[PDB]
CSV table of C-alpha atoms in Angstrom, one decimal:
chain,number,residue,atom,x,y,z
A,1,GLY,CA,10.4,17.7,4.4
A,2,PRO,CA,12.0,14.6,3.7
A,3,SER,CA,11.1,11.1,5.1
A,4,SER,CA,12.6,10.8,8.3
A,5,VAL,CA,11.5,7.2,8.3
A,6,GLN,CA,12.4,3.5,5.8
A,7,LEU,CA,9.1,2.9,4.2
A,8,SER,CA,9.0,-1.2,4.2
A,9,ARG,CA,11.2,-0.8,0.8
A,10,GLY,CA,9.6,-3.7,-1.4
A,11,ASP,CA,6.5,-5.2,0.7
A,12,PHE,CA,3.8,-4.9,-1.9
A,13,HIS,CA,5.8,-7.8,-3.2
A,14,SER,CA,6.0,-9.7,-0.4
A,15,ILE,CA,2.3,-9.4,0.6
A,16,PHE,CA,1.5,-11.0,-2.7
A,17,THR,CA,4.1,-13.4,-2.8
A,18,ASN,CA,5.0,-14.3,0.8
A,19,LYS,CA,2.6,-16.3,2.0
A,20,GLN,CA,3.3,-15.8,5.6
A,21,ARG,CA,2.7,-13.0,5.1
A,22,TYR,CA,0.6,-12.1,3.0
A,23,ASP,CA,-1.4,-14.5,5.6
A,24,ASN,CA,-1.1,-11.4,7.5
A,25,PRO,CA,0.0,-7.7,5.9
A,26,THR,CA,0.5,-6.0,8.6
A,27,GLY,CA,3.1,-3.4,10.3
A,28,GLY,CA,4.3,-1.7,6.5
A,29,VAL,CA,5.7,1.6,7.0
A,30,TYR,CA,3.5,3.4,3.2
A,31,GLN,CA,4.0,6.5,1.6
A,32,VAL,CA,0.1,8.7,0.3
A,33,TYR,CA,0.8,8.2,-3.8
A,34,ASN,CA,-2.5,9.7,-4.9
A,35,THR,CA,-5.8,10.4,-3.6
A,36,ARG,CA,-9.2,11.7,-4.7
A,37,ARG,CA,-15.2,5.1,-4.3
A,38,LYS,CA,-13.7,8.5,-2.3
A,39,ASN,CA,-11.3,5.6,-0.1
A,40,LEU,CA,-10.3,4.3,-2.7
A,41,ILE,CA,-6.0,5.8,-3.0
A,42,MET,CA,-3.2,4.5,-3.8
A,43,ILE,CA,0.1,3.8,-1.7
A,44,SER,CA,3.4,2.9,-1.3
A,45,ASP,CA,5.9,1.4,-0.5
A,46,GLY,CA,9.7,3.5,-1.5
A,47,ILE,CA,9.7,0.7,-4.9
A,48,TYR,CA,6.5,-0.1,-6.2
A,49,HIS,CA,2.9,1.6,-5.7
A,50,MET,CA,-0.7,0.2,-5.7
A,51,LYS,CA,-4.5,0.5,-5.1
A,52,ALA,CA,-5.7,1.1,-1.0
A,53,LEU,CA,-9.2,0.2,0.2
A,54,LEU,CA,-9.3,2.4,3.3
A,55,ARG,CA,-12.1,0.9,5.4
A,56,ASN,CA,-14.0,0.9,8.6
A,57,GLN,CA,-11.7,2.8,11.1
A,58,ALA,CA,-8.9,3.0,7.9
A,59,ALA,CA,-11.8,5.2,6.6
A,60,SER,CA,-12.7,7.0,10.1
A,61,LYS,CA,-9.0,8.3,9.7
A,62,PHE,CA,-8.9,9.3,6.4
A,63,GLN,CA,-11.0,11.9,7.1
A,64,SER,CA,-10.0,13.4,10.3
A,65,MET,CA,-6.4,13.3,9.0
A,66,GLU,CA,-7.0,14.8,6.2
A,67,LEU,CA,-4.6,12.5,4.4
A,68,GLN,CA,-3.6,13.3,1.7
A,69,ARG,CA,0.1,12.4,-1.1
A,70,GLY,CA,4.1,12.7,1.2
A,71,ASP,CA,1.7,11.0,4.6
A,72,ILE,CA,3.7,8.2,6.0
A,73,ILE,CA,0.9,5.7,6.5
A,74,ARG,CA,1.6,2.0,9.5
A,75,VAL,CA,-0.4,-0.7,8.9
A,76,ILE,CA,-2.4,-1.8,11.0
A,77,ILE,CA,-5.0,-3.7,10.6
A,78,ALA,CA,-5.2,-4.7,6.6
A,79,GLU,CA,-6.2,-8.2,4.5
A,80,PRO,CA,-5.0,-8.6,0.8
A,81,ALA,CA,-7.6,-9.7,-2.4
A,82,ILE,CA,-6.8,-9.6,-5.6
A,83,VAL,CA,-9.1,-9.5,-8.3
A,84,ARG,CA,-7.7,-12.7,-10.3
A,85,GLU,CA,-10.5,-12.1,-12.9
A,86,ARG,CA,-9.0,-8.5,-13.8
A,87,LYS,CA,-5.1,-8.9,-12.5
A,88,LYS,CA,-5.9,-6.3,-10.1
A,89,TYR,CA,-4.4,-6.6,-6.5
A,90,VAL,CA,-5.5,-4.2,-3.9
A,91,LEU,CA,-4.6,-3.8,-0.2
A,92,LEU,CA,-7.7,-3.4,2.2
A,93,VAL,CA,-7.0,-1.7,4.9
A,94,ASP,CA,-9.0,-1.5,8.4
A,95,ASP,CA,-6.4,0.5,10.6
A,96,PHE,CA,-3.9,2.8,10.3
A,97,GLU,CA,-1.7,4.8,12.2
A,98,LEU,CA,-0.4,8.4,11.1
A,99,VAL,CA,3.6,8.0,11.4
A,100,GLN,CA,4.7,11.8,9.5
A,101,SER,CA,2.1,14.0,7.7
A,102,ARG,CA,3.3,15.2,4.7
A,103,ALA,CA,6.5,14.2,3.6
A,104,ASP,CA,8.4,14.8,0.3
A,105,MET,CA,8.2,11.6,-1.8
A,106,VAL,CA,10.3,8.9,-1.2
A,107,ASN,CA,10.0,7.2,-5.1
A,108,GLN,CA,8.0,9.4,-7.4
A,109,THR,CA,8.9,6.6,-10.1
A,110,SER,CA,7.7,3.6,-8.3
A,111,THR,CA,6.9,0.8,-10.3
A,112,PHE,CA,2.5,0.1,-10.1
A,113,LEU,CA,2.4,-3.5,-8.0
A,114,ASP,CA,-0.4,-4.6,-11.2
A,115,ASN,CA,2.0,-4.0,-13.4
A,116,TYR,CA,4.9,-5.6,-11.9
A,117,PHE,CA,2.7,-9.0,-11.6
A,118,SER,CA,1.3,-8.9,-15.3
A,119,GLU,CA,4.5,-9.0,-16.7
A,120,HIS,CA,6.0,-11.8,-13.7
A,121,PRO,CA,2.5,-13.8,-13.6
A,122,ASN,CA,4.9,-16.3,-12.3
A,123,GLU,CA,5.4,-14.9,-8.8
A,124,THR,CA,1.8,-13.8,-7.5
A,125,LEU,CA,0.5,-15.6,-5.0
């Protein structure tokens, strides 16, 4: 069914351009974009998609929740990671809650965050 919550549109851009958000990148509402490093997934903020590494309690919930594309989550504990040498971005997620199971994708044609910052190198923290 359709997503009955609003995603945190553009928040992946905010996490890596606004220092206050970078320092505490929590509370965002995101949609799972793809799953498969069995704990590395792709998530969507409705505008961008980016890689997230699920660790600790988030890795446990990945398993217990059978997390899949379309699920909507709220991130509770997280930290940003930039691999500068490779221009790669990852959200390290230690805990999240499930908001909605198997919602229709809000955006099927989002921009990959790494691609966005590689062509706008000026913007990144």
